[PDB]
């Protein structure tokens, strides 16, 4: 694979502009009765002649407003296939452990169209589990024409962006590497990883930037990447990362590859 | 034009759980947030929701003896989604 840093930055940090002013962010699913509340709207744009929706704020949303509960099929933990994205699933915990997933795909409820945050600056929603269900809570004042984008809130034990557990008010098990919202988790891991590097050092952050791009381009194998990254950053990754990358890296590559050329 | 609730009252039910009550504000309410956490404590503050239909909730799993700050406030829609200002009380079970 021979991708440029700019086309990587596009998939991790970019957005498509519409005929208007507001832009759609990229959780560009579909790689090859809404009951929508007041103040919100569903917004289609086109990407590769493939329809792509997003939930936008038509008016105003104050910080601390909570929407939900998320609605969808109940997927038992065993029947979720591997090498798949599962763009619209949430992990449901009971008593400290993974119970089941809740699949919003094809629900037709408006919340299943809210895309994920790939990094915090574009994030205005927090995913929050209460009782058995998922809610989205605004973490910022949401202004008109700004897109609603969610990520796993605190109350989820996370490592560099990826959630491992339901943060305790004690239990001990990680969700298996094959699960919900995998491509979004991968993006969130890579961006968080990049920011993590920059905070240590400019030279170290630049090393990671090239090291990640080389990984995305399969120039370097994951275990090769893992070692060199730990060498360059002087910081140990959790064991889940290698199988996580082996499972989900080919999703970012497939999407990255999926780009139209001008006309 | 008012959003803040009134007459919030707290009663102990078990040494670790309270029954709280309030009466709705002027505005039409979607959610009430209920919030509890140790007064003057470095402990985090917890919050759940009850629908506008309800004007009572039960808080549970509290430390007996320790006083908590309970807070309720309304989430409404008025030319935008807003969360109002809260009513507060402190109470040791």
Residue numbers in the entry:
A (entry chain A): 2 to 33, 53 to 189, 195 to 288
B (entry chain E): 1 to 93
The authors write:
To overcome this problem, we designed a fusion construct of Prdm14 and Mtgr1 in which the two proteins were linked with a ten-residue linker (GSSGSSGS), a common strategy for stabilizing heterodimers. The addition of Mb(S4) readily led to crystallization of Prdm14-linker-Mtgr1, and we determined its structure to a resolution of 3.06 Å through single wavelength anomalous diffraction (SAD) phasing using selenomethionine-labeled crystals. As expected, the monobody bound exclusively to Prdm14, burying 604 Å2 surface areas, a similar interface size to other monobody/target complexes. The Prdm14 SET domain in our structure has a total of nine β-strands (β1-β9) arranged in three antiparallel β-sheets with a short 310 helix (η1) inserted between β6 and β7. The Mtgr1-Prdm14 interaction interface buries 2180 Å2, a large interface but still within the observed range for high-affinity protein–protein interaction interfaces with a low nanomolar KD value. The interactions between the Prdm14 SET domain and Mtgr1, mediated primarily by αA and αD, contribute 65% of the total buried surface area. The substantial interaction interface between the pre-SET region and Mtgr1 (35% of the interface) rationalizes the importance of the pre-SET region in the Prdm14-Mtgr1 interaction. Arg105 located at the N-terminal end of Mtgr1 αA sits in a pocket formed by Ser290, Met292, Cys319 and Tyr339 of Prdm14 and its guanidinium moiety makes hydrogen bonds with the side chains of all of these residues. Lys109 in Mtgr1 forms a salt bridge with Glu294 from β5 of the Prdm14 SET domain. We also note that His211 and Ala212 in the pre-SET region of Prdm14 occupy the S-adenosyl-L-methionine (SAM)-binding site and thus, at least in the context of the presented structure, preclude the binding of this cofactor necessary for methylation.
